[PDB]
Amino acid sequence: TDPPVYPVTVPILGHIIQFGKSPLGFMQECKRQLKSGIFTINIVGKRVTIVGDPHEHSRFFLPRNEVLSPREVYSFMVPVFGEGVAYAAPYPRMREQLNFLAEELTIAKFQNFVPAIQHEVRKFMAANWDKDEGEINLLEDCSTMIINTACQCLFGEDLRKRLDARRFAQLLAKMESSLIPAAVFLPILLKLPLPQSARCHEARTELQKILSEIIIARKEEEVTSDLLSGLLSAVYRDGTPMSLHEVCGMIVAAMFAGQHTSSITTTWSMLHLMHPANVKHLEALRKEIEEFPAQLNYNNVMDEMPFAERCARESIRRDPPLLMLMRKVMADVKVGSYVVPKGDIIACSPLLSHHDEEAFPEPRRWDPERDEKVEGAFIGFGAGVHKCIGQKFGLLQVKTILATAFRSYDFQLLRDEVPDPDYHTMVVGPTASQCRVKYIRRK
Ligand code: HEM
Ligand SMILES: OC(Cn1cncn1)(Cn1cncn1)c1ccc(F)cc1F
């Protein structure tokens, strides 16, 4: 009942190299070699048990923060979110804060959002996709459109007056680059190394101050909503409002979370769609869009593009951006047979589960018409107590980009096969240097 231990070739490496080079092969091999979807690698000195059996996802996603905890594992973010915020806060508090953010990303806010997205998409397309024909890096361009659209939805004109797409991206970048993700397995890393640290603190204070000012200026003004005003309106179980520290942290949580995943989802989708093999699916998308108007609206994209939602999801399915969900085991928990002992990190990998051949036949084929064959096997937005709260919003942007893009352009790869994924980044997407693409304007 203690899960099998993959043997540790070098006391140094643990497994950090092999895993980093091809995670699926590595984990599938671990499964066959060890005869069990549940097994333990020793990454660099800490045991990491992996729930690689999708019939058992609920063992990972359902227990409370008192058993299966995210605080430790997400400490390495304590400087982007800030010391108070999200998972660094006592459990009930964390949950309140997240709720307020989520209260701000539901279908109820999507009222003015589609126009605001669509406008940016056609604006980007009108400065940068000008010609009959042209080459672009699709991952950059999507990435840009995402950050643009998201601001348009979430900040006011006057928030945008001083902090735009550029400024903000510059700012997240000088924050993201503080991050030591390997510090999950050696928390000792958090302490010592401090070079890109003060560069992160000066960004967050810069942002936090722009904010302070905007609020101040926002209060002479009055003498309608957006993401920021929403969060300052929130009230905790007791008295307290949210402190500036906290609001700021949630605005970063949000912009940090959606920044790459949404881009990557859009880009993958478009990539598959433009591939000769996948003509049917692109016929399928093109039928879906036909009787759509030029200005879209809530109905067009929310209720009328199940096929586009299937494509977005199939992309995340094949090539999930967040490859590993993890938690710190506080109390011994059973997972199938096997007890996972306190102290272990426990993990659940969308990448491994999305290639269970029972759950997803022919897993490496991109097929938006497929459905999961084991229920809950798809964990691309996770599940249970920490299921993604931005999913409805992310796919609002992906779908609108799809719709908008495929209305007016075709696309050729400059490559025989769709790009391989690049497992070298925190958040995995197609290989940047394989995403140069040819766009054509229809007629
Ligand atoms: C394609 C877009 C996205 C993908 C593929 C994605 C993937 C995920 C996954 C796998 C989780 C669960 C994490 C865990 O179990 O530890 C998650 C959670 C979360 N996402 Fe996303 N995510 C996406 C978009 C977003 C966006 C745009 C936002 C912007 C708000 C957002 C905010 C959050 C938050 C706050 C959580 C954790 C909330 C909690 O612990 O209750 N997500 N996402
Ligand atoms: O899950 C993330 C944090 N993370 C895990 N690996 C890399 N970043 C990313 N994420 C979740 N949805 C989209 N991106 C997130 C970002 C913010 C947050 F509040 C919680 C949280 F898990």
Numbering used by the authors: 30 to 252, 258 to 477
Provide text from the study.
This same CYP51Tc structure was used as a model against the 2.7 Å CYP51Tb–fluconazole data. As expected, fluconazole is bound in the active site by coordination to the heme iron via the aromatic nitrogen atom of a triazole ring and by multiple van der Waals and aromatic stacking interactions. Perhaps both ring conformations co-exist in the CYP51Tc-fluconazole complex, possibly correlated with the conformation of the BC-loop which affects H-bonding pattern of Y103. Given that the CYP51Tb active site is virtually identical to that of T. cruzi, the same equilibrium would be expected to occur in T. brucei. The tunnel-forming residues are invariant between CYP51Tc and CYP51Tb with the exception of four conservative substitutions at positions 46, 105, 215 and 359. The residue at position 105 (highlighted cyan in Fig. 7) is known to dominate substrate specificity with respect to the methylation status of the C-4 atom in CYP51 sterol substrates. I105 in T. cruzi allows efficient conversion of C4-dimethylated 24-methylenedihydrolanosterol while the bulkier F105 in T. brucei favors C4-monomethylated norlanosterol.
Trypansoma cruzi, the protozoan agent of Chagas Disease, is closely related to two other major global pathogens, Leishmania spp., responsible for leishmaniasis, and Trypansoma brucei, the causative agent of African Sleeping Sickness. Here we report the crystal structures for the CYP51 target in T. cruzi (CYP51Tc) (resolutions 2.35 Å and 2.27 Å) and that of the closely related CYP51 ortholog from Trypanosoma brucei (CYP51Tb) (resolutions 2.7 Å and 2.6 Å), each bound to an anti-fungal triazole drug, either fluconazole or posaconazole. Nevertheless, CYP51Tc and CYP51Tb do share 83% sequence identity, a fact which has been crucial for successfully determining their crystal structures and makes it possible to extrapolate structural features learned from one enzyme toward the other.
